[PDB]
Amino acid sequence: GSHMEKLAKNKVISIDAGRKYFTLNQLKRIVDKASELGYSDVHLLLGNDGLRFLLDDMTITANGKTYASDDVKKAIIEGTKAYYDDPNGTALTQAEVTELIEYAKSKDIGLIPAINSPGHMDAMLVAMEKLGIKNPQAHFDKVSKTTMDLKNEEAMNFVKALIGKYMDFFAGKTKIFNFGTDEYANDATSAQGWYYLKWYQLYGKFAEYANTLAAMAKERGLQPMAFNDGFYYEDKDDVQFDKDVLISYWSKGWWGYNLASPQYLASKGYKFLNTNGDWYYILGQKPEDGWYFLKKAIENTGKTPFNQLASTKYPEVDLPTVGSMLSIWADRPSAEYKEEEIFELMTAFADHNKDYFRANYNALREELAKIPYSKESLEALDAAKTALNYNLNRNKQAELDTLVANLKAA
Ligand SMILES: CC(=O)N[C@H]1/C(=N/OC(=O)Nc2ccccc2)O[C@H](CO)[C@@H](O)[C@@H]1O
Ligand SMILES: [Br-]
Ligand SMILES: [Br-]
Numbered sequence: 133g134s135h136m137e138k139l140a141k142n143k144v145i146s147i148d149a150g151r152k153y154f155t156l157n158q159l160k161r162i163v164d165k166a167s168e169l170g171y172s173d174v175h176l177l178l179g180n181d182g183l184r185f186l187l188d189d190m191t192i193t194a195n196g197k198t199y200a201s202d203d204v205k206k207a208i209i210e211g212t213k214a215y216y217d218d219p220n221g222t223a224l225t226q227a228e229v230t231e232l233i234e235y236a237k238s239k240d241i242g243l244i245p246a247i248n249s250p251g252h253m254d255a256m257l258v259a260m261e262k263l264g265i266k267n268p269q270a271h272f273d274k275v276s277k278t279t280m281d282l283k284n285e286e287a288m289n290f291v292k293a294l295i296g297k298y299m300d301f302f303a304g305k306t307k308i309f310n311f312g313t314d315e316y317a318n319d320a321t322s323a324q325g326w327y328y329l330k331w332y333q334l335y336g337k338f339a340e341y342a343n344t345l346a347a348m349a350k351e352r353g354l355q356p357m358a359f360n361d362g363f364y365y366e367d368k369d370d371v372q373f374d375k376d377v378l379i380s381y382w383s384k385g386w387w388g389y390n391l392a393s394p395q396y397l398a399s400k401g402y403k404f405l406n407t408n409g410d411w412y413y414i415l416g417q418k419p420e421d422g423w424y425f426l427k428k429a430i431e432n433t434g435k436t437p438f439n440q441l442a443s444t445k446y447p448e449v450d451l452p453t454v455g456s457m458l459s460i461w462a463d464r465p466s467a468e469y470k471e472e473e474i475f476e477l478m479t480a481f482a483d484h485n486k487d488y489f490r491a492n493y494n495a496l497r498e499e500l501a502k503i504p505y506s507k508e509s510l511e512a513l514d515a516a517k518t519a520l521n522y523n524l525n526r527n528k529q530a531e532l533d534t535l536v537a538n539l540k541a542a
């Protein structure tokens with residue numbers, strides 16, 4: 133599309149701060165790097181196996197009773213340490229996420245939070261047991277460590293209330309809320325979660341829960357987002373899903389993980405955030421470890437087109453996306469986070485797609501903040517400010533720099 137259409141697309145960096153602790157300063161630096169490279173958003177997983185975000189008030193009402201704030205905080209901390217007791221820290225505070233959002237906003241960077249369920253919720257499962265909610269776990273080939281039992285009302289009522297509170301905090305602070313839903317019970321079904329749901333006639337109950345979280349998002353003025361996995365599994369539609377969800381599409385799946393195609397979901401009216409698995413990097417991952425190692429991720433930022441949805445060949449298949457997301461995962465969270473690796477990956481994606489990414493506007497904001505005299509000198513500042521172009525992409529840094537230089541002189 134046009135110059136305007138390209139720059140209006142979302143350019144997103146995702147950070148798995150669910151499995152692994154990131155300090156507020158580490159995340160601010162990511163925001164900084166995103167702002168310079170011309171991204172529009174930071175996607176931040178806060179619940180993803182671990183749950184590394186606590187609000188000031190964590191009081192929950194569900195199941196006819198209340199769970200007091202201190203007990204919820206204690207339970208969640210215990211759940212999170214039980215998944216991984218990160219030496220670097222456990223959870224971000226309300227004050228810290230509030231500051232990250234404000235800080236990002238000052239650099240025209242949005243934040244997109246993710247709180248995962250009913251899969252990738254190890255911490256919430258143990259937390260619920262510490263609060264007296266027995267057997268919240270899905271149980272298939274074994275008792276799952278990651279996933280909630282969809283028939284357990286007590287657990288479901290609790291989790292929904294908890295996600296409601298988080299959504300309450302983000303309401304009016306962010307546009308988007310990602311409720312996840314990927315890889316249901318992968319640990320207990322050898323990554324055949326959806327097949328197991330259908331087998332047990334529980335997929336309809338998955339949709340009921342997915343639709344609930346979508347509705348919850350919308351009634352709090354948040355645009356819902358979820359991963360594509362659970363939606364219209366195997367291109368079948370006898371179970372219906374909320375059409376308003378923004379789909380974070382990462383893959384059509386693997387042998388016998390028979391996900392809906394992007395073609396099929398588009399046909400149902402869905403819009404996509406292009407979250408191609410091609411751009412995945414797992415901290416510390418090398419060729420010998422499996423998929424999603426650094427060298428290949430870096431290669432793919434050039435090799436896979438910006439608009440190419442996974443399992444499709446662009447432009448032969450050309451489906452509406454709202455933008456694209458590159459993803460940093462923490463599967464082994466004891467692995468050392470090396471900022472420079474993430475920065476190289478981010479830079480490569482921006483460099484290969486200069487039409488989509490903004491120019492770096494940081495020097496401009498620094499020169500503007502220096503403003504507080506004759507009519508001649510004030511006239512000089514008048515025109516130099518008028519000459520500023522806020523619409524420049526990454527191809528036009530030199531051009532922006534000249535405009536800033538002229539402002540400095542004035
Ligand atoms: C939505 C998503 O990307 N989920 C997981 C994810 N899924 O990627 C897969 O390839 N998952 C998968 C593998 C085999 C069978 C089914 C799904 O990738 C990341 C890096 O490994 C994990 O951190 C994520 O939790
Ligand atoms: Br079913
Ligand atoms: Br590598």
Ligand SMILES: [Br-]
Nearest residue numbers: 464465466467
């Ligand atoms: Br680990």
